Ligand binder design. Structure first.
Ligand SMILES: [Cl-]
Ligand SMILES: [Cl-]
Ligand SMILES: [Cl-]
Ligand code: NA
Ligand code: NA
Ligand code: NA
Length: 152
């Protein structure tokens, strides 16, 4: 019903504070509450939640999915807590390797000069804007698209 502990077991996923540190961070009431929380996945991206976040017994393996050019936080609208609770709250998403594909070669375009010339960053920025997100950055070296959302 209410099994104890944060669940995150999948390869290349990590938290900040680390899972080791979060296990040491349960308070006298039984809650794990941190000031600033990141969940990331090496090679794919990360999600930073500023402020006071209650992580108590969260099944991050079920809730969080950091994929190529996509994150999913709560797979089913029906399992999502009210706004402000859990991870359904403002966050900064970083997606790595957001590079366009050359349509002739079907290889990714990673040249910063070619990306600048086409102003690829502005394509990502307008996509963020039209989705109601706030564009933060596009770092061409790593293909890192950074944007803020108000919730998931
Ligand atoms: Cl916990
Ligand atoms: Cl980051
Ligand atoms: Cl490629
Ligand atoms: Na997996
Ligand atoms: Na990615
Ligand atoms: Na981020």
């Amino acid at each position: 019903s209410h099994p104890a502990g944060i669940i995150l077991t999948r390869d290349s996923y990590y938290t900040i504070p680390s899972m080791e540190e979060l296990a040491r961070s349960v308070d006298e009431n039984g809650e794990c509450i941190v000031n600033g929380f990141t969940i990331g996945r090496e090679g794919f991206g990360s999600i930073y939640f500023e402020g006071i976040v209650n992580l108590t017994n969260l099944d991050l393996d079920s809730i969080v999915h950091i994929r190529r050019k996509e994150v999913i936080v709560y797979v089913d609208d029906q399992n999502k807590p009210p706004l402000g609770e859990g991870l359904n709250r403002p966050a900064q998403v970083t997606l790595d390797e957001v590079w366009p594909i050359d349509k002739t070669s079907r290889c990714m375009i990673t040249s910063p000069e070619r990306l600048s010339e086409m102003n690829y960053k502005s394509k990502l920025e307008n996509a963020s804007r039209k989705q109601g997100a706030q564009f933060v950055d596009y770092r061409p070296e790593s293909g890192s698209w950074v944007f803020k959302v108000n919730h998931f």
